[PDB]
Design a protein around this ligand. Structure first.
Ligand SMILES: [Zn+2]
Lengths: 128, 110, 154, 99, 60, 78
RNA sequence: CCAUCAUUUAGUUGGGCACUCUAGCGAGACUGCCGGUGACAAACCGGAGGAAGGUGGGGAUGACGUCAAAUCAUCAUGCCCCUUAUGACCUGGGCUACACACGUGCUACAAUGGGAAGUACAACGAGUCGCUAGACCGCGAGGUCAUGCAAAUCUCUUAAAGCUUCUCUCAGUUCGGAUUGCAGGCUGCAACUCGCCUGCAUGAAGCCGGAAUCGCUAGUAAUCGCGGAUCAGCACGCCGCGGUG
């Protein structure tokens, strides 16, 4: 077969995605994406690159994901799917580029400082 | 009258209404209702006179009455009349377990 | 701040209805960052709207917003030791801010057995010029257009 | 494969230097030495109060990293054993040869 | 009294749960690290001078 | 919770075994406030040091599982 | 680690180092180009390209000086004082006392919730007389026989909020969990004063808190768990880590 592979990262989670011609479906870690991320609607965040460019089918998606939480490792899946689509035809690097969908989100958990309750929350004060 | 001691409430399931007798908590009600075979079904007490007598005769094998208050009362009574460090505290309205009395007596001394 | 004006905090339009207003409404119901609960609440409320004497949840929601949002707000200020209040105009983003805020605040205080039975009912009562939200708007308009007295040269 | 090394140290410079020493003097007399594979670099963390009597709300933090390195030898020879157990430099680096 | 207590610390204890650690330079009994056997503020003093091998200032 | 046999001290148990024969003396003066009241301590009069003095306590029967320190307090309030 | 292959309970075993990962060495961000403003200047506003754009995000790094600020109790040390006692050894007791007043926190006053059953997803760290696999006994905290590991190999460690069903119905309550009675477990020579945990029973105040006052500008506030220093045992405190946002 022919296939297309990309790697997506977001917030302590890394995903390895594979594009394969088919009829439109995605399975992750040997389960169905309806069951793996059955939260409400994060799937409609995942299927956005197909919605903007290469509109819209048809590829079966196979991914291998590990790390982070359920909402991080779906933005990571989106990242990877977008990169793989870029790999198919390089002419997509404009429509995708306009709508984000191509950049890594570098918003990590800020580190805790000493003498503070959290990264920025301080203790309660009393002028007297 | 009702099914033990006095006045198990209406309109609620038995697993909860049986809590209202002094000495029946939550797991005890479960075990009593299970040694017979009575369920809740559904959110009401619409029992039978065989189910009431069923769940009435078994409570007799426990200490769920003013037979329990006697036990607890005479226990604290034996405590305060030997030495006794615990009873001395029982006689002052002060925590009887070691509680570093700076605020922890608002419950124990009002 | 002190340096000068700042940005506007772009929002991400929710994918169900593709409407940034529903996004802000989800963000206002949410407490403690539990967003899936807020989303379930808003979607059940809109299902309740359409199912019972409805046309579409976006339409009646926009009309309720239009009937609630204010157009004349006052600001209590200090001059030199005596404080008063004066009316002023109202820029657009503040308007929708206030609208959402009032609707959620006064649906939270309804007194039924579900946040949906409160939210759907309250924005329906709002799209028909009723409910403490509309009365709050009218209290505001009455405070203004009266306290213009000590505002006419402010 | 019936011979393998392990090297720990606090400086990756000295670590890589000695790893190249052993790899070179191994493949000079034999063949097929698996590369100096890197291991995940343990780290510790020590927080301390930097004042002798009071002021808990100002501290100073220390650490101690420990770099790791792995080398496996394939098909030794009655000369590699000799030419290996003899070289010894340098001082503050741990060496542990297990068959 | 801090010269008799270092002596009393080094003799074998009268019961299992009667031994306790002290610093080795000084005799400080509070906040000693038992990988180094050094107290809170001899550690910060010998870390500078680069005498303890390993330890250095951390930032990330 | 010493379900592996309750706890007396040897000196205390030695003294009580030694007097177990006849009618007893009030001079059993021990510090030993950790010991429990075995069912043989009845009728005697133990002296329990409370950090300052030796308080005597007469051992009835209802006090048979408690400790010897529960009958000689140490704080002196009012 | 498992994409192209056979295989089983499985990345396991044959195979491979493609991908992820680990960690050495390099690249990359400079108002560097393009338009306008402005004394043409510095600088500011907008665009292109790029993972990143204007000190990209965070840490370490604290001048001359101020408060005779703090510490002779970490350690040193000038002067003064004690010396059959202000030095030294032992048992038992305070340091935990309670008419009250002030500060810093935790748990709640419920339906955006309480209870029952099922299904998921992390990261930082620790381990030899230590971390305990597995099987069995106990309602439970735990116990017995035993197994791997001085560690990317084994273990601590199936995270909790989350999602899906079934209930309960606005009440001082199937909310809340203080206080007290009885029976146990674990460490320790020994848990009365004075430990932590388990089970059954009891079921307080509290229905969102005046004057006044605090924290915070984005993966931040709010909320949820996990680890370890100290340590036989003992954390609502402290230092870190990540999830939803
Ligand atoms: Zn020291």
């Amino acid at each position: 077969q022919v296939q297309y592979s990309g790697t997506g990262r977001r917030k302590n989670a890394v995903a390895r995605v594979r594009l394969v011609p088919g009829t439109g479906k995605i399975t992750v870690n040997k389960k169905d994406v309806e069951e793996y991320i059955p939260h409400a609607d994060l799937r409609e965040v995942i299927n956005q690159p197909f919605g903007v460019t290469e509109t819209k089918g048809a590829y079966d998606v196979i991914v291998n994901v590990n790390g982070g939480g359920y909402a991080g490792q779906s933005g990571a899946i989106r990242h990877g799917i977008a990169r793989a689509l870029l790999q198919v035809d390089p002419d997509f690097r404009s429509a995708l580029k306009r709508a984000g969908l191509l950049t890594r989100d570098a918003r990590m958990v800020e580190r805790k400082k000493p003498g503070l309750k959290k990264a920025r929350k301080a203790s309660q004060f009393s002028k007297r | 009258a009702r099914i033990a001691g006095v006045d198990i409430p209406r309109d609620k399931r038995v697993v909860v209404s049986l809590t209202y007798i002094y000495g029946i908590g939550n797991t005890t009600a479960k075990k009593v209702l299970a040694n017979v075979g009575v369920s809740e079904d559904v959110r009401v007490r619409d029992l039978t006179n065989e189910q009431t007598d069923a769940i009435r005769a078994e409570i007799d094998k426990l200490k769920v009455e003013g037979d329990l208050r006697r036990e607890v009362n005479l226990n604290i009574k034996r405590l305060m009349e030997i030495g006794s460090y615990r009873g001395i505290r029982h006689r002052r309205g002060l925590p009887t377990r070691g509680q570093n009395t700076k605020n922890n007596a608002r419950t124990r001394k009002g | 701040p002190r340096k000068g004006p700042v940005a506007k905090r772009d929002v991400l339009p929710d994918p169900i209805y593709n409407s940034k207003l529903v996004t802000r409404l989800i963000n206002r119901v949410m407490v403690d960052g539990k967003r899936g609960i807020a989303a379930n609440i808003i979607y059940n409320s809109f299902d309740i709207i359409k199912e019972s004497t409805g046309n579409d949840p976006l339409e009646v929601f926009e009309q309720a917003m239009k009937n609630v949002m204010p157009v004349l707000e006052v600001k209590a200020r200090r001059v030199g030791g005596s404080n008063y209040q004066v009316p002023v105009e109202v820029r657009p983003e503040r308007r929708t801010t206030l609208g959402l805020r009032w609707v959620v605040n006064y649906a939270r205080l309804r007194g039924e057995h579900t946040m949906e039975e409160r939210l759907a009912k309250e924005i329906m009562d709002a799209a028909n010029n009723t409910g403490a939200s509309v009365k709050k708007r009218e209290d505001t308009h009455k405070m203004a257009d009266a306290n213009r007295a000590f505002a006419h040269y402010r | 494969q019936k011979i393998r090394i392990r090297l720990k140290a606090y400086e990756h410079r000295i670590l890589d230097q000695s790893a190249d020493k052993i790899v070179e003097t191994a493949k000079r007399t034999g063949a097929d030495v698996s590369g100096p594979i890197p291991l995940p670099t343990e780290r510790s963390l020590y927080t301390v109060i930097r004042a002798t009597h009071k002021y808990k709300d100002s501290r100073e933090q220390f650490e101690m990293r420990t770099h790791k390195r792995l080398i496996d030898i394939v098909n030794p020879t009655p000369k590699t054993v000799d030419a290996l157990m003899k070289l010894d430099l340098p001082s503050g680096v741990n060496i542990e040869i297990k068959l | 009294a801090k010269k008799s207590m270092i002596a009393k610390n080094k003799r074998p204890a009268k019961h299992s749960t009667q031994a306790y650690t002290r610093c080795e330079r000084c005799g400080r009994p509070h906040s000693v690290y038992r990988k180094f056997h050094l107290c809170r503020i001899c550690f910060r003093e010998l870390a500078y001078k680069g005498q303890i091998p390993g330890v250095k200032k951390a930032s990330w | 919770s010493l379900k592996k046999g309750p706890f007396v001290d040897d000196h205390l148990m030695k003294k009580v075994e030694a007097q177990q024969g006849a009618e007893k003396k009030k001079v059993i003066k021990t510090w030993s406030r950790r010991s429990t009241i075995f069912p043989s301590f009845v009728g005697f009069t133990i002296a329990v040091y409370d950090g300052r003095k030796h308080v005597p306590v007469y051992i009835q029967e209802d006090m048979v599982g408690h400790k010897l320190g529960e009958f000689a307090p140490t704080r002196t309030y009012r």
